[PDB]
Amino acid sequence: QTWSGPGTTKRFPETVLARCVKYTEIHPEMRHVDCQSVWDAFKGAFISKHPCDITEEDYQPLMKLGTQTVPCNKILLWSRIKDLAHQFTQVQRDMFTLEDTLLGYLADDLTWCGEFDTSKINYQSCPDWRKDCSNNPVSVFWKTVSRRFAEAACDVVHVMLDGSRSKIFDKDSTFGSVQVHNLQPEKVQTLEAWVIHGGREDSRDLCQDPTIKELESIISKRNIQFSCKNIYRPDKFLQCVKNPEDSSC
Numbered sequence: 246q247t248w249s250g251p252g253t254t255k256r257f258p259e260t261v262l263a264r265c266v267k268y269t270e271i272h273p274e275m276r277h278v279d280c281q282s283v284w285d286a287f288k289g290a291f292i293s294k295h296p297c298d299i300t301e302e303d304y305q306p307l308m309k310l311g312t313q314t315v316p317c318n319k320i321l322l323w324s325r326i327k328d329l330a331h332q333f334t335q336v337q338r339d340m341f342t343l344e345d346t347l348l349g350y351l352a353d354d355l356t357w358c359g360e361f362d363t364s365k366i367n368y369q370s371c372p373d374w375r376k377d378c379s380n381n382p383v384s385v386f387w388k389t390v391s392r393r394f395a396e397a398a399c400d401v402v403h404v405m406l407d408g409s410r411s412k413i414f415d416k417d418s419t420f421g422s423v424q425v426h427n428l429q430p431e432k433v434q435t436l437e438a439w440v441i442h443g444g445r446e447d448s449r450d451l452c453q454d455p456t457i458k459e460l461e462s463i464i465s466k467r468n469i470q471f472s473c474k475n476i477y478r479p480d481k482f483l484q485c486v487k488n489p490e491d492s493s494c
Protein backbone atom coordinates (compact mmCIF):
# COMPACT_ATOMS: atom_id res chain seq x y z
CA GLN A 246 0.00 0.00 0.00
CA THR A 247 1.29 3.43 -0.95
CA TRP A 248 -1.93 4.99 0.32
CA SER A 249 -4.41 4.18 3.10
CA GLY A 250 -7.64 4.52 1.10
CA PRO A 251 -9.33 2.12 -1.28
CA GLY A 252 -7.80 1.82 -4.74
CA THR A 253 -9.63 2.83 -7.89
CA THR A 254 -12.97 1.02 -8.14
CA LYS A 255 -12.71 -2.11 -10.27
CA ARG A 256 -13.71 -1.48 -13.89
CA PHE A 257 -13.61 2.28 -13.25
CA PRO A 258 -13.17 3.26 -16.94
CA GLU A 259 -15.91 0.95 -18.24
CA THR A 260 -18.14 2.13 -15.40
CA VAL A 261 -17.76 5.85 -16.04
CA LEU A 262 -18.25 5.25 -19.76
CA ALA A 263 -21.33 3.06 -19.27
CA ARG A 264 -22.76 5.55 -16.74
CA CYS A 265 -22.18 8.35 -19.20
CA VAL A 266 -23.88 6.40 -21.98
CA LYS A 267 -26.82 5.54 -19.71
CA TYR A 268 -27.14 9.12 -18.45
CA THR A 269 -26.96 10.72 -21.89
CA GLU A 270 -29.54 8.22 -23.24
CA ILE A 271 -31.98 9.04 -20.41
CA HIS A 272 -31.43 12.80 -20.12
CA PRO A 273 -32.22 14.52 -23.40
CA GLU A 274 -30.44 17.78 -22.47
CA MET A 275 -27.17 15.82 -22.38
CA ARG A 276 -27.60 14.19 -25.84
CA HIS A 277 -24.86 16.35 -27.35
CA VAL A 278 -22.38 14.69 -24.98
CA ASP A 279 -19.61 12.54 -26.41
CA CYS A 280 -18.95 10.06 -23.62
CA GLN A 281 -15.52 9.10 -24.95
CA SER A 282 -14.61 12.79 -24.81
CA VAL A 283 -16.01 12.97 -21.28
CA TRP A 284 -13.96 9.94 -20.28
CA ASP A 285 -10.82 11.41 -21.85
CA ALA A 286 -11.32 14.71 -19.97
CA PHE A 287 -11.98 12.76 -16.73
CA LYS A 288 -8.76 10.70 -17.13
CA GLY A 289 -6.79 13.80 -18.07
CA ALA A 290 -7.62 15.35 -14.71
CA PHE A 291 -5.72 12.69 -12.71
CA ILE A 292 -3.72 10.31 -14.95
CA SER A 293 0.07 10.88 -14.70
CA LYS A 294 -0.46 13.37 -11.87
CA HIS A 295 0.56 13.00 -8.27
CA PRO A 296 -2.63 12.00 -6.42
CA CYS A 297 -1.91 14.52 -3.63
CA ASP A 298 -1.34 17.40 -6.04
CA ILE A 299 -4.66 17.55 -7.87
CA THR A 300 -6.17 21.01 -8.45
CA GLU A 301 -9.57 22.21 -9.60
CA GLU A 302 -7.91 23.38 -12.83
CA ASP A 303 -7.15 19.70 -13.55
CA TYR A 304 -10.92 19.08 -13.76
CA GLN A 305 -11.75 22.11 -15.90
CA PRO A 306 -11.90 20.14 -19.18
CA LEU A 307 -14.31 17.68 -17.53
CA MET A 308 -16.36 20.55 -16.05
CA LYS A 309 -16.52 22.08 -19.55
CA LEU A 310 -17.73 18.88 -21.24
CA GLY A 311 -20.05 18.10 -18.32
CA THR A 312 -21.67 21.56 -18.49
CA GLN A 313 -25.29 21.09 -17.51
CA THR A 314 -28.04 23.57 -16.63
CA VAL A 315 -30.13 22.23 -13.77
CA PRO A 316 -33.29 24.04 -12.64
CA CYS A 317 -31.73 26.28 -9.98
CA ASN A 318 -34.80 26.18 -7.73
CA LYS A 319 -35.00 22.37 -7.60
CA ILE A 320 -31.73 21.49 -5.98
CA LEU A 321 -31.47 19.02 -3.13
CA LEU A 322 -28.24 19.10 -1.17
CA TRP A 323 -27.58 16.39 1.39
CA SER A 324 -25.15 15.36 4.07
CA ARG A 325 -24.69 11.79 5.45
CA ILE A 326 -28.03 10.63 4.02
CA LYS A 327 -27.08 9.81 0.40
CA ASP A 328 -29.43 6.87 0.01
CA LEU A 329 -32.67 8.58 1.07
CA ALA A 330 -31.73 11.69 -0.93
CA HIS A 331 -31.35 9.61 -4.10
CA GLN A 332 -34.40 7.43 -3.46
CA PHE A 333 -36.26 10.70 -3.12
CA THR A 334 -35.06 12.19 -6.46
CA GLN A 335 -35.56 8.84 -8.25
CA VAL A 336 -39.23 9.32 -7.46
CA GLN A 337 -39.45 13.13 -7.27
CA ARG A 338 -37.86 13.56 -10.71
CA ASP A 339 -38.56 17.30 -10.42
CA MET A 340 -35.61 17.64 -8.02
CA PHE A 341 -31.86 17.10 -8.45
CA THR A 342 -29.07 16.07 -6.20
CA LEU A 343 -25.55 16.50 -7.47
CA GLU A 344 -25.52 12.81 -8.33
CA ASP A 345 -28.48 13.42 -10.63
CA THR A 346 -26.29 15.62 -12.87
CA LEU A 347 -24.03 13.92 -15.41
CA LEU A 348 -20.82 14.54 -13.48
CA GLY A 349 -22.14 13.56 -10.07
CA TYR A 350 -23.78 10.47 -11.57
CA LEU A 351 -20.53 9.42 -13.29
CA ALA A 352 -18.53 9.54 -10.08
CA ASP A 353 -20.98 8.51 -7.33
CA ASP A 354 -19.60 5.74 -5.08
CA LEU A 355 -16.44 5.48 -7.15
CA THR A 356 -12.82 5.96 -6.14
CA TRP A 357 -10.03 6.76 -8.60
CA CYS A 358 -6.47 7.98 -8.62
CA GLY A 359 -3.39 7.80 -10.78
CA GLU A 360 0.34 7.84 -10.09
CA PHE A 361 2.87 10.56 -10.77
CA ASP A 362 5.54 8.37 -12.36
CA THR A 363 3.23 6.59 -14.85
CA SER A 364 0.09 6.88 -16.94
CA LYS A 365 -1.74 3.98 -15.25
CA ILE A 366 -4.84 4.04 -13.04
CA ASN A 367 -4.02 2.96 -9.48
CA TYR A 368 -6.33 0.09 -8.51
CA GLN A 369 -4.21 -0.80 -5.49
CA SER A 370 -4.71 2.27 -3.26
CA CYS A 371 -5.66 5.93 -3.36
CA PRO A 372 -5.04 8.73 -0.86
CA ASP A 373 -7.48 8.89 2.00
CA TRP A 374 -8.63 12.53 2.52
CA ARG A 375 -7.61 12.19 6.16
CA LYS A 376 -4.90 9.56 6.59
CA ASP A 377 -3.10 10.72 3.42
CA CYS A 378 -3.81 14.09 1.73
CA SER A 379 -6.66 16.41 0.84
CA ASN A 380 -5.83 17.38 -2.75
CA ASN A 381 -6.51 13.90 -4.12
CA PRO A 382 -8.45 13.14 -7.35
CA VAL A 383 -11.63 12.18 -5.54
CA SER A 384 -11.73 14.97 -2.92
CA VAL A 385 -10.81 17.62 -5.48
CA PHE A 386 -13.50 16.44 -7.91
CA TRP A 387 -16.21 16.38 -5.22
CA LYS A 388 -15.23 19.74 -3.75
CA THR A 389 -15.26 21.33 -7.25
CA VAL A 390 -18.58 19.92 -8.48
CA SER A 391 -20.17 20.32 -5.04
CA ARG A 392 -19.16 23.98 -5.03
CA ARG A 393 -20.42 24.54 -8.56
CA PHE A 394 -23.73 22.78 -7.77
CA ALA A 395 -24.17 25.04 -4.75
CA GLU A 396 -23.32 28.12 -6.87
CA ALA A 397 -25.99 27.05 -9.34
CA ALA A 398 -28.77 26.99 -6.74
CA CYS A 399 -31.41 29.64 -6.36
CA ASP A 400 -34.70 30.35 -4.58
CA VAL A 401 -35.45 27.61 -2.05
CA VAL A 402 -32.57 25.16 -1.72
CA HIS A 403 -33.32 22.01 0.26
CA VAL A 404 -30.87 19.90 2.21
CA MET A 405 -31.48 16.47 3.59
CA LEU A 406 -29.66 15.81 6.87
CA ASP A 407 -29.23 12.63 8.90
CA GLY A 408 -30.89 13.28 12.27
CA SER A 409 -29.13 10.21 13.68
CA ARG A 410 -25.53 11.58 13.47
CA SER A 411 -25.07 13.68 16.66
CA LYS A 412 -23.64 16.31 14.39
CA ILE A 413 -26.85 16.54 12.36
CA PHE A 414 -25.33 19.59 10.77
CA ASP A 415 -21.60 19.06 10.49
CA LYS A 416 -19.51 22.12 9.60
CA ASP A 417 -16.75 19.76 8.43
CA SER A 418 -18.89 17.87 5.89
CA THR A 419 -18.84 18.86 2.21
CA PHE A 420 -22.29 20.34 2.67
CA GLY A 421 -21.10 22.26 5.74
CA SER A 422 -17.68 23.36 4.53
CA VAL A 423 -18.22 23.98 0.81
CA GLN A 424 -21.89 24.12 -0.15
CA VAL A 425 -23.19 26.27 2.71
CA HIS A 426 -20.51 28.86 1.82
CA ASN A 427 -21.19 28.79 -1.91
CA LEU A 428 -24.94 29.37 -1.91
CA GLN A 429 -25.23 32.74 -3.60
CA PRO A 430 -26.90 35.31 -1.33
CA GLU A 431 -28.05 37.20 -4.45
CA LYS A 432 -29.99 34.12 -5.69
CA VAL A 433 -30.80 31.90 -2.71
CA GLN A 434 -33.87 32.91 -0.77
CA THR A 435 -34.06 30.06 1.75
CA LEU A 436 -32.11 26.99 2.74
CA GLU A 437 -34.56 24.45 4.09
CA ALA A 438 -33.27 21.45 5.99
CA TRP A 439 -35.15 18.17 6.13
CA VAL A 440 -33.85 16.36 9.17
CA ILE A 441 -34.32 12.62 8.70
CA HIS A 442 -35.03 10.61 11.86
CA GLY A 443 -33.44 7.14 12.06
CA GLY A 444 -34.26 5.06 15.14
CA ARG A 445 -36.53 3.82 17.94
CA GLU A 446 -39.85 5.31 19.13
CA ASP A 447 -41.06 8.97 19.33
CA SER A 448 -38.25 11.41 18.64
CA ARG A 449 -37.29 14.98 19.62
CA ASP A 450 -37.84 17.99 17.40
CA LEU A 451 -34.43 17.76 15.82
CA CYS A 452 -34.81 21.16 14.18
CA GLN A 453 -34.01 22.49 17.68
CA ASP A 454 -30.70 20.65 17.79
CA PRO A 455 -27.70 22.93 18.55
CA THR A 456 -26.02 22.01 15.23
CA ILE A 457 -29.18 23.10 13.40
CA LYS A 458 -29.07 26.41 15.30
CA GLU A 459 -25.42 26.58 14.20
CA LEU A 460 -26.46 26.07 10.54
CA GLU A 461 -29.25 28.61 10.84
CA SER A 462 -26.85 31.16 12.30
CA ILE A 463 -24.21 30.62 9.59
CA ILE A 464 -26.68 30.89 6.74
CA SER A 465 -28.52 33.87 8.31
CA LYS A 466 -25.25 35.79 8.40
CA ARG A 467 -24.95 35.14 4.68
CA ASN A 468 -28.37 36.87 4.25
CA ILE A 469 -30.23 33.62 3.45
CA GLN A 470 -33.36 32.52 5.35
CA PHE A 471 -33.48 29.23 7.16
CA SER A 472 -36.25 26.70 7.40
CA CYS A 473 -36.26 23.26 8.97
CA LYS A 474 -38.56 20.25 8.80
CA ASN A 475 -38.47 16.99 10.70
CA ILE A 476 -39.02 13.91 8.64
CA TYR A 477 -39.99 11.56 11.48
CA ARG A 478 -40.76 8.50 9.38
CA PRO A 479 -38.56 8.25 6.26
CA ASP A 480 -40.40 5.08 5.14
CA LYS A 481 -43.77 6.85 5.17
CA PHE A 482 -42.07 9.93 3.69
CA LEU A 483 -40.97 7.96 0.61
CA GLN A 484 -44.31 6.19 0.39
CA CYS A 485 -46.00 9.58 0.33
CA VAL A 486 -43.54 10.75 -2.32
CA LYS A 487 -44.27 7.66 -4.49
CA ASN A 488 -48.03 8.22 -4.34
CA PRO A 489 -48.76 11.79 -3.17
CA GLU A 490 -52.39 11.87 -4.35
CA ASP A 491 -53.32 9.86 -1.24
CA SER A 492 -55.02 10.81 2.05
CA SER A 493 -52.62 10.72 5.06
CA CYS A 494 -49.86 12.35 2.99
Ligand SMILES: NC(=O)c1ccc[n+]([C@@H]2O[C@H](COP(=O)([O-])OP(=O)(O)OC[C@H]3O[C@@H](n4cnc5c(N)ncnc54)[C@H](O)[C@@H]3O)[C@@H](O)[C@H]2O)c1
Nearest residue numbers: 322323324325326343353374383384387391418419420421
Ligand atom coordinates in the same frame (compact mmCIF):
# COMPACT_ATOMS: atom_id res chain seq x y z
N1 LIG B 1 -21.82 11.74 -4.03
C1 LIG B 1 -20.77 11.94 -3.22
O1 LIG B 1 -20.00 10.87 -2.74
C2 LIG B 1 -20.39 13.33 -2.81
C3 LIG B 1 -19.15 13.55 -2.19
C4 LIG B 1 -18.88 14.77 -1.59
C5 LIG B 1 -19.85 15.76 -1.63
N2 LIG B 1 -21.07 15.55 -2.24
C6 LIG B 1 -22.08 16.63 -2.23
O2 LIG B 1 -21.98 17.29 -0.97
C7 LIG B 1 -23.04 16.90 -0.12
C8 LIG B 1 -22.71 15.60 0.63
O3 LIG B 1 -21.36 15.57 1.09
P1 LIG B 1 -21.05 15.61 2.66
O4 LIG B 1 -19.60 15.45 2.94
O5 LIG B 1 -21.86 16.74 3.21
O6 LIG B 1 -21.82 14.27 3.17
P2 LIG B 1 -21.04 12.92 3.53
O7 LIG B 1 -20.12 13.10 4.67
O8 LIG B 1 -22.06 11.88 3.76
O9 LIG B 1 -20.22 12.57 2.18
C9 LIG B 1 -20.78 11.86 1.09
C10 LIG B 1 -19.77 10.85 0.53
O10 LIG B 1 -18.61 11.51 0.07
C11 LIG B 1 -17.46 11.13 0.82
N3 LIG B 1 -16.74 12.37 1.15
C12 LIG B 1 -17.18 13.43 1.90
N4 LIG B 1 -16.21 14.38 1.93
C13 LIG B 1 -15.16 13.93 1.18
C14 LIG B 1 -13.90 14.46 0.87
N5 LIG B 1 -13.54 15.68 1.28
N6 LIG B 1 -13.04 13.73 0.07
C15 LIG B 1 -13.39 12.49 -0.41
N7 LIG B 1 -14.62 11.97 -0.10
C16 LIG B 1 -15.49 12.67 0.69
C17 LIG B 1 -17.97 10.37 2.05
O11 LIG B 1 -17.12 9.32 2.51
C18 LIG B 1 -19.30 9.84 1.57
O12 LIG B 1 -19.11 8.60 0.94
C19 LIG B 1 -24.19 16.62 -1.06
O13 LIG B 1 -24.91 17.81 -1.35
C20 LIG B 1 -23.48 16.03 -2.27
O14 LIG B 1 -24.16 16.31 -3.47
C21 LIG B 1 -21.34 14.35 -2.82
